[model samples]
Target chain A: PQITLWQRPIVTIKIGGQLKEALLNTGADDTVLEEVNLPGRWKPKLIGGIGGFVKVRQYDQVPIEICGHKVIGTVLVGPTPANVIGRNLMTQIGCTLNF
Target chain B: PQITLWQRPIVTIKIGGQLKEALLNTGADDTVLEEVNLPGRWKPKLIGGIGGFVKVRQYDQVPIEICGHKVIGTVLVGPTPANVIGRNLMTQIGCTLNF
Candidate 1:
């Protein structure tokens, strides 16, 4: 599937048996969810962005279905303006930028 | 060209007759350059990001060559974490998300 840049590349995702929405953010290095309740042990980590730095919960080996492509990888949970699917997960699902 | 997400999608861009490197950022809605001396009249504007909002100069119909695809559009000059070519420029180049 090819998605044009006419609008934000927002896609539906299934994480932890729940359907959610996230933006396919090529600029972001890591994926961060806005508000999620992942029951497990997570570590506190910091992610830096255009604005500054933020502390988030890092969950590893999380199973997520992004636009029907299922992959297990790391997912960050914290307070973000929006749910973002970053390069880490994009790479696993063979997502690429085409012109 | 299909750009994989294994690495940050950095590309050389020409603006104001100067060559610079910038990230192909889909998360960013507008293009923003840091420390760039774009000559002409520009109005002050505010752009919000992951951390907070930053004041910047809004330059309209600025000529920019993104990976050799030239286009004229709005540009923002301010102090940012990095030089970013956002959706505005990506659309002009027909860049899309493909899997």
Candidate 2:
């Protein structure tokens, strides 16, 4: 018999700061957010994945709310020139990092 | 006397329903958008620039209001994971897609 685990989308809270509505990524080892819409700072770091360690980083942090949930995390920190939602804090509140 | 041209940040409006605050890209030849925070669709195409030919596609269209301006446009159109606000729509109306 196969057991199944139902999952839900990770609750992403927007970052609060001079920038507006930055996406929060809790799946990251460290609190990281991004503002890919513009060029940002944050050196590239290796992100260990199954395929291999991909380069990554953190740039900015903004406040956000989802599913009536909210929090603040460092955003705009990805070196790949994109945004993300990490797993760090998501696992704390029964939050699954589903796409 | 020094002649100068300055740019401003694009007015990014939030998406309606399911998602929120999806940024718009007007610099693109075709209207395209992105949701770097999530896995998305739209196959990749080649682009020309200092980065060489990059893969691109369109994902979502959201209402964005920058500096009290707002409009709808597809944003998640790049093969990459980062979000963008193209120049096609942004160049017009004296709007500056600064940050």
Candidate 3:
């Protein structure tokens, strides 16, 4: 039997979301909250481009814990289908992942 | 005489650079400092997709003044040719444009 390997596990952080089924993509540099899960006061705006620019709503400066470290900052509200952790989170951890 | 007006006078913030000759684009939601002006410590990474993923260097939590209000947040480093103030700054000012 033969099995192909997959990419290394990237890091992730959530406000009230989950992991395992996490949306971790190093390509991005910020933690985006899904619009569906976003609070009622959250107002999502159009971020047009390729991939059609998802909606990014507003978030107050919240405390986010990651890899045993914590940082406080505002989060961008992404849609429910696509929540992600981008670069800003990485810097908060002061980490560098090996390729 | 008739006036074919241009864009409004957008706000700007600089670390150790100049303004007026700034790039104000609301399309983006983050304030990006030009890579050219980025400090030695900034580590730029590629953001994939359209525009071919330009390099985004790191930055510290700096107080950026926009529309007479200042907000402290990590900034994304863009190339010198395209330094811009995105929606983050707009949100900081707590105002929106009609167009």
Candidate 4:
């Protein structure tokens, strides 16, 4: 399927069984969410972006559903402007930049 | 043409006669550069992102080259994390998100 980049490529995603809106960011290295509750233990990790570095809970092997495709990977939860689906998950879904 | 999202979609670009690497950012609303000198007059504009807002000079109809494709559009120049090619120019070059 092809998607237009008319606006921020935001998509509905299910994380830990909860629905959230995430930006499809090809520039981001890891998937980041604003905040989410998880049962398992996590490690503290800092992610840096255009803004700066942020502390996040790195949860491994989290189940996330983007659009309709299910993907299991690490999800970083923290205080982010928006939830972002990075290249890590984008590649799993076979996302490509076409011109 | 198809481009893989294996990493930050950094591509070579030419702006104001200088070549630089820019991230193909779908989440950004407008194209922004770290800093550049333009000949014509520009207006002061504020662009907000994950971090915060920054004062930029907004130049209209600036000539830019992305992967050999020529594009003329508005470009914001200021203190940014990196040179970003946003959806504004991405659409002009027929860029799309595919999965």
Candidate whose TM-score is highest: 4
TM per prediction: 0.91, 0.27, 0.38, 0.92
Candidate 1 ranges with C-alpha deviation above 4 Å: A49-53, B49-52
Interface RMSD of candidate number 4:
1.0
Ranking by lDDT: 1, 4, 3, 2
DockQ for the candidates, in order = 0.85, 0.02, 0.02, 0.81
Which lDDT tens digits does candidate 3 get at residues A1-99?
Answer: 111113223344545554323333333445665543534465456653555666667676656765445767566766544555544554555433221
Query: Which fraction of the native contacts appears in each prediction?
Result: 0.93, 0.00, 0.00, 0.90
| lDDT tens digits by residue: candidate 1, A1-99 | 889887999999999989999999999899999868988999998997434678999999999999899998899999887899999999989999988
Q: lDDT tens string, model 2, A2-99?
A: 11112212233444423333223322345444434424465656664644665656444334443344644444354443344443333332343110
Docking class of 4: high
Superposed on all Cα atoms, model 2 deviates from the true structure by an RMSD in Å of 17.6
Lowest summed lDDT window (length 10), candidate 3 chain B: B1-10
lDDT of 4 by residue, B12-96 (tens): 9999899999999887779999878888899999887434567899999999999999989999999877889999999989899
Instruction: Tell me which of candidates 1 and 3 scores higher on DockQ.
Output: 1
Per-residue CA lDDT of candidate 2, range B1-99, in tens? Answer: 110111222234444333323223222344444534434455555564544665665444445543344655445444533334444434322332111
